[PDB]
Amino acid sequence: MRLLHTMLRVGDLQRSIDFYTKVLGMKLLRTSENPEYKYSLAFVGYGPETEEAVIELTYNWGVDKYELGTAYGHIALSVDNAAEACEKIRQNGGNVTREAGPVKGGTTVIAFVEDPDGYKIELIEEGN
Amino acid sequence: MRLLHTMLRVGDLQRSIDFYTKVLGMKLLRTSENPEYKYSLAFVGYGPETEEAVIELTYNWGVDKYELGTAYGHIALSVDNAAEACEKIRQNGGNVTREAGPVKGGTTVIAFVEDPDGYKIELIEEGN
């Protein structure tokens, strides 16, 4: 078995696609609309769903805000250049909650950011 | 770049670990404890962190309950037998919210369950 995706509800679909793709460098894998239940979906990721875990963004028509709660943590993504991503994230709207730098008691560069809906994103600068 | 993991705060570390490992078939990849920040972590997944996406179970010492909220959707997992998984889960600290079965206007078999902390998990099935 395997981990397929993580589903998150967003306040604005396109704004979300835009961020994950244009900012985080992900690609729009697929999108769907459900007239019956009044919601739209978009799957964004770094590779094909068949090979890896991706993100499923859900947008319920007319719903622009949710309650984040205190249980959900975040999603951690591997990053090419944490420093740079922070910059991109910064100048592209999003917030940088933890500037790129080595992790406490370590060397690995990591940062923490927030997507357009306030979701927390951990960026980690990391067989064959 | 890739999806590393999804972090979720749990009310009971071992409880969650047992569920994801014993019930969901995952493996405990690694654990750690931070006294400064007072938390304990357990990484669970169907593969090593370098190969796939995993789940980071976070236990904040002395904290046994969170507010699930309405933003976070779920995590989807592939299963060989959704019906079997449902029964196993329902009988082992979990809860079935959506009996296994094809999706309206489709043949893909899926179910929705809840882990011990209430987290929604989507089960997607991969001539009896």
Side-chain angles (χ1 to χ4, degrees):
Chain A
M1 325 133 83
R2 64 186 181 108
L3 198 157
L4 304 155
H5 59 259
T6 298
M7 192 287 259
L8 306 172
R9 295 168 188 97
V10 306
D12 182 316
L13 202 60
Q14 198 53 51
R15 168 187 75 176
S16 184
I17 301 188
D18 291 354
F19 176 84
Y20 287 99
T21 56
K22 302 174 42 107
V23 181
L24 305 166
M26 273 176 213
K27 29 196 193 77
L28 175 53
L29 311 150
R30 72 185 159 100
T31 178
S32 66
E33 180 176 299
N34 194 309
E36 191 165 316
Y37 302 87
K38 301 163 173 164
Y39 74 85
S40 295
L41 311 154
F43 295 69
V44 304
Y46 294 114
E49 282 178 275
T50 71
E51 306 165 315
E52 55 203 80
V54 302
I55 297 182
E56 172 183 36
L57 317 157
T58 305
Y59 168 80
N60 286 287
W61 311 345
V63 183
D64 61 290
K65 174 96 180 183
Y66 298 83
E67 304 176 15
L68 176 63
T70 69
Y72 177 68
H74 54 260
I75 279 182
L77 298 177
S78 82
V79 65
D80 285 336
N81 188 332
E84 212 300 297
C86 277
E87 285 312 294
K88 211 180 174 140
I89 294 150
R90 183 184 321 276
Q91 88 209 172
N92 292 289
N95 311 278
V96 172
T97 49
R98 200 236 189 224
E99 299 291 340
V103 66
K104 192 162 170 160
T107 56
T108 306
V109 171
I110 65 138
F112 275 89
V113 310
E114 286 183 353
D115 85 352
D117 305 270
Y119 284 120
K120 181 183 302 172
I121 299 153
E122 173 189 48
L123 313 163
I124 310 196
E125 200 166 293
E126 307 184 326
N128 59 301
Chain B
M1 292 187 284
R2 61 202 191 96
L3 205 163
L4 302 171
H5 57 256
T6 297
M7 187 284 232
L8 315 163
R9 288 175 195 93
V10 301
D12 178 323
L13 195 50
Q14 193 65 52
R15 180 178 63 179
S16 304
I17 292 171
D18 300 329
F19 182 82
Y20 283 98
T21 62
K22 301 186 187 287
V23 178
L24 296 176
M26 300 187 173
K27 284 292 177 352
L28 183 60
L29 310 166
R30 61 172 177 110
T31 53
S32 75
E33 59 88 29
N34 190 301
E36 198 186 318
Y37 305 93
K38 316 158 165 285
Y39 65 83
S40 294
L41 311 173
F43 295 71
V44 292
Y46 293 113
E49 294 182 77
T50 50
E51 294 181 21
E52 309 279 316
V54 312
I55 298 164
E56 171 183 15
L57 299 176
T58 302
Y59 172 71
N60 285 291
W61 309 345
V63 193
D64 63 34
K65 176 66 144 59
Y66 298 87
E67 310 184 326
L68 183 60
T70 67
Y72 179 66
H74 55 261
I75 284 180
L77 304 182
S78 68
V79 306
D80 308 10
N81 181 182
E84 174 197 66
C86 281
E87 298 302 312
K88 202 176 299 209
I89 293 155
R90 63 178 355 135
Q91 286 204 285
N92 294 99
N95 170 44
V96 186
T97 55
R98 199 266 200 191
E99 310 287 339
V103 290
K104 162 172 215 317
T107 45
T108 311
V109 177
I110 66 149
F112 274 86
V113 311
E114 292 166 343
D115 78 349
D117 301 87
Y119 290 109
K120 279 183 188 161
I121 293 161
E122 183 192 25
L123 312 178
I124 309 197
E125 211 174 70
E126 43 174 355
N128 59 297

